[PDB]
Design a protein around this ligand. Structure first.
Ligand SMILES: [Mg+2]
Ligand SMILES: [Mg+2]
Lengths: 247, 247
């Protein structure tokens, strides 16, 4: 139903305005990358290890907000086929502070590895071209761990460690960018993970804000991503905690 | 029109789900307060000054998301009269990490002052009661600079300084929590302010995320807050930056 597609996508509008237009969003991005630099500079690794930083791409280093804008304007729920065309369009922007942090790490005895669920087979060329254009250093193909068979990222983190690196910090917009322990889990478990790691945030786990999509969306309800549009609308509305209007 | 009120409020749903339900939101709050503690501990003030921290309340230390939930469920645009009832309902929650940071500052040779646009005359009693209940220390009336005649906050910051304090850092969710220079201005000027202060974020300006409301909403269009509901909907949709769907 067109009506349902419209309602689902309209629900993203205010958060999209915030991400695209606000100075507040920029300030949060700068806050994250300023904290990340401090953590990188303080980091020490085991003898014989090289220093690695793991960075997510989408909504962490790369800004894909125009794709979300297209979804709103065309009443289009997420579809991987549309996403692949967006990547191929080579119009990604950089998240504020990301390029500077990336290039600083790479020029100060570190290496940033991009662990991302952009697809290795169909989305790599656009990703690399955009990152070169946006000014990122160190975007040779071997710096990338794009998605092959698994969306969970822990195995790719382990690959990096096997190459003689110690990962000193992780940057992401999704808790699944920090490991697998709440991958595919609902939001109660995801909040619990955050509470159990409270002291790591802004130190070894660096967060960027993303009010538009993520593991928290699936986290709204069991089997969310398999529900139809009406089901996803209902899941969102049922998750709302509301004042009853009484004293 | 009921239809317009519905559309305007539905546009907040996804960002509200994110703020209310996600672990990611909690992680951003912990990141902010972890960074704030580091900045406080590092701060030095002029001889003879006392150390102050200025903190915003709404969506910085206090969580009012159930009011937003009520707006969504009842198709209610913001109204100060409803807000006053919400405050009186004494159901505010605490932003994660805020109480711990607040109490740490107050027990380590600092003082937190609450500079907030909750209203001094009608909203003070509920604010103080909620903060006591939530575990904040140092919530005697003199710690508060609630709104009297002006929403811009710089004059209240100056009052604090006149009492012999040097403000070592500011915590907020709205750029207007850091001064007056972009108060009432559109988002281009607000983004420019952030760029001009890039290095301060996560150090002396501590940001909390708020995708639901703020100076950035008014910042979407000249005279936004005076437009009718249809006008505000149009302003939001016109602000959207969208991919054209082409390569
Ligand atoms: Mg991402
Ligand atoms: Mg506030």
């Amino acid at each position: 139903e067109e009506h349902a597609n419209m309602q689902l996508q309209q629900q993203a509008v205010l958060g999209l305005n915030w991400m695209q237009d606000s100075g507040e969003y920029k300030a949060l991005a700068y806050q994250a990358y300023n904290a990340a630099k401090v953590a990188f500079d303080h980091a020490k690794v085991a003898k014989g290890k090289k220093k690695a930083v793991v960075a997510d791409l989408d909504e962490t280093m790369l800004d894909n907000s125009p794709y979300a804008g297209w979804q709103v304007q065309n009443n289009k729920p997420f579809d991987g086929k549309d996403w692949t065309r967006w990547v191929d369009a080579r119009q990604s922007r950089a998240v504020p502070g990301a390029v500077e942090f990336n290039n600083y790490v790479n020029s100060h005895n570190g290496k940033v590895f991009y662990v991302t669920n952009r697809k290795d087979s169909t989305e790599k060329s656009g990703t690399i071209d955009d990152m070169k254009r946006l000014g990122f250093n160190g975007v040779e193909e071997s710096a990338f761990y794009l998605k092959k068979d698994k969306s969970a990222k822990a195995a790719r983190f382990a690959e990096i460690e096997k190459q003689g690196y110690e990962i000193v910090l992780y940057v992401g917009d999704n808790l699944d960018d920090f490991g697998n322990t709440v991958y595919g889990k609902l939001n109660a478990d995801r909040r619990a993970f955050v509470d159990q790691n409270q002291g790591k945030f802004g130190k070894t786990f660096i967060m960027l804000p993303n009010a538009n999509y993520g593991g928290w969306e699936g986290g709204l309800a069991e089997g969310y991503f398999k529900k139809d549009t009406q089901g996803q609308i209902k899941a969102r509305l049922d998750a709302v905690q509301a004042w009853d209007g009484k004293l």
